[PDB]
Design a protein around this ligand. Structure first.
Ligand SMILES: NC(=O)C1=CN([C@@H]2O[C@H](COP(=O)(O)OP(=O)(O)OC[C@H]3O[C@@H](n4cnc5c(N)ncnc54)[C@H](O)[C@@H]3O)[C@@H](O)[C@H]2O)C=CC1
Ligand SMILES: NC(=O)C1=CN([C@@H]2O[C@H](COP(=O)(O)OP(=O)(O)OC[C@H]3O[C@@H](n4cnc5c(N)ncnc54)[C@H](O)[C@@H]3O)[C@@H](O)[C@H]2O)C=CC1
Lengths: 336, 336
């Protein structure tokens, strides 16, 4: 963690997004001097970027040449969270993915490489830590772009001493993830972004939660405020050139996720759940041990507590979320 | 190999370059129906693209949107040889590298992905074959771009059945590599492209050949006509989704390279050579066994025979080469 961030100047690329908006909130709580949010709103809503005396917002792509040339060596920390959201959208259009997922990292790093005030540049990568990768089983252009940004992070550190730290995480959930956020990116996943907000929304509407294959799939969910603190710990204390898993270390099946959401929301509809078998998940989830040992970081928000917090926020904001989702009604109808 | 290529339509992206020009010559010998060379001449000379009834030349980047949209499903084979030449230039300007080394592959594959006449798409990658890669020890943006094109090759095959074959090679030498070819790409390596043509040129001029560290470094040199035949064997018979080393399997030290070039040219000047020790090369060169077994391909041109052929060509073309090199005199003078 740290008050190492108190009174500092920070840039959050992708800072209007789900993880980004939460990181910005936490940085302001820690008393940073300035946050420069650079976000084109491609998969985000402007209501997630506060109008705050300490927040500067550039509604602009990080690949923009003018914006890049305008940047000054006035930042202590940079968090690079931009992506092309997400797997499905990237498959639909690999060139839209490349512009907003691969080239973003390269152009940013190229601009930052001779900056001297920078203490750390933290890159959100996809989830002990190894730096060996296979050419196979990269299911999407998104997955490749995330790996490519790790390659860039290592290169700019070795060649130009850019103080990069790669933070690998997965299955983040919590307040601030808005179904339908941003522009239509090609597929229904623009609306139905991820399983948790989908289930919470449908449960709040009293609808049956669709389980694929009885919900035997397991995931290591992590609450977004823990991810924000993990990213801050990487910034403050992560080793330049290094990589850390930011992970809960706890697996929850989709069936149990749905069960919990139904019980918290009062959704009395049926669940077509099946018993998990040894072949259903035969594999790898990230160990949280390195971050615990080196950074003193642990993601301790339980799936029960994180879900209550998320549902509370979703309830309070349901009308706003519904209006955002509805902008895609026509695209949703045309799809396929 | 094959007459599988007789009477076919072929595209050679990067076909005005060193390996590309040699491949085009060999394809015409094998009686292809048409060769479409797409080359922006960034590191090539127009004199390497013949004015032939069977050759169409598009002096255009493969990333050009209009060019890409204009392409028709009229190709049996595509060879993707374009790159940003080379390591040093890419370090000087990673964004010039990305445009001409990473984005080239993605935009090409995106255009080709629904073409139905395609039998094989052969990608020149950098050098038994494994598909595991490290984030470390990628010394340049060039090296990363070459690996990224392997990622793309695997993805487009799995997702869209694009019939890709990755051909890994290194240390190609021979006729058609012109010192100073193309535009100034930032550094003296635009002129002094590689050790072999550098040594041949200097030897022909009666100059001492500079050895770094007594020339203890070893390389697996491969003659360019063998590489052209290797690429053709990949096209004809390589497994879609697969990868093959196109390699000589024989190591030559830089000292022996220089010795041979001096002896063939009659260069009587001194050589500051040192004995090779076990720590000088402690590592990995590609095994040629898979290509031998699956494709019936072996690169059998010896370093002695290939060097004679290369020197003969360089002598015959020295005036033309000198004029090409001289275009960079001013840039060379300003450098650093
Ligand atoms: N949410 C999750 O479970 C996981 C997230 N990640 C990574 O975390 C980071 C944040 O992702 P989320 O907040 O979940 O998604 P998000 O889509 O809410 O956030 C990404 C932000 O990037 C912005 N953006 C897109 N293109 C841009 C460009 N050219 N210039 C500037 N900004 C741009 C979007 O408008 C959006 O605000 C991403 O890098 C993502 O790959 C990694 C693993 C898991
Ligand atoms: N020569 C060697 O020892 C090795 C070569 N390679 C690979 O072999 C391929 C051929 O390389 P060489 O012939 O040695 O170099 P080269 O520089 O002579 O050939 C590359 C060609 O690509 C063209 N080009 C550059 N940007 C382009 C763009 N946007 N669109 C179209 N064409 C473009 C250049 O003008 C040049 O004619 C490259 O992919 C290279 O990475 C791989 C390992 C070793």
């Amino acid at each position: 963690n740290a008050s190492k961030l108190a009174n500092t100047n920070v840039m959050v690329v992708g800072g209007a997004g789900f993880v980004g908006s939460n990181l910005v909130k936490r940085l302001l709580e820690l008393g940073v001097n300035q946050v420069h949010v650079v976000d084109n709103l491609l998969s985000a809503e402007k209501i997630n970027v506060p109008d705050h005396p300490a927040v500067r917002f550039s509604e602009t792509s990080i690949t923009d040449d003018a914006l890049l040339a305008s940047l000054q060596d006035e930042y202590d920390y940079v968090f690079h969270l931009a992506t092309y959201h997400g797997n499905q959208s990237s498959i639909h259009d690999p060139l839209a993915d490349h512009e907003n997922n691969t080239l973003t990292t390269l152009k940013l790093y190229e601009r930052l490489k001779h900056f001297k005030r920078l203490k750390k540049v933290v890159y959100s990568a996809a989830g002990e830590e190894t730096d060996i990768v296979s050419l196979h089983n990269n299911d999407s252009p998104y997955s490749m772009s995330k790996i490519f940004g790790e390659f860039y992070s290592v290169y700019y550190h070795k060649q130009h001493q850019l103080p990069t730290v790669r933070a690998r995480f997965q299955n983040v959930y919590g307040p601030g993830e808005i179904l339908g956020a941003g522009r239509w990116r090609g597929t229904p996943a623009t609306v139905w972004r991820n399983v948790t907000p989908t289930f919470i929304y449908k449960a709040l509407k009293g609808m049956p939660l669709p389980l694929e294959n009885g919900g035997v799939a397991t995931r290591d969910f992590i609450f977004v405020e823990d991810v924000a603190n993990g990213l801050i710990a990487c910034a403050a204390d992560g080793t330049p050139g290094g990589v850390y898993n930011i992970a809960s270390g706890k697996e929850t099946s989709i069936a149990d996720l749905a069960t919990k959401i139904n019980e918290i929301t009062g959704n009395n509809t049926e669940l077509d759940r099946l018993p998990k078998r040894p072949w259903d998940n035969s594999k790898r989830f990230g160990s949280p041990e390195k971050a615990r040992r080196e950074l003193g970081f642990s993601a301790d928000v339980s799936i029960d507590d994180g879900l209550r917090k998320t549902i509370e926020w979703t309830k309070a904001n349901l009308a706003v979320i519904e209006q955002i989702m509805r902008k895609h009604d026509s695209a949703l109808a045309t799809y396929g």
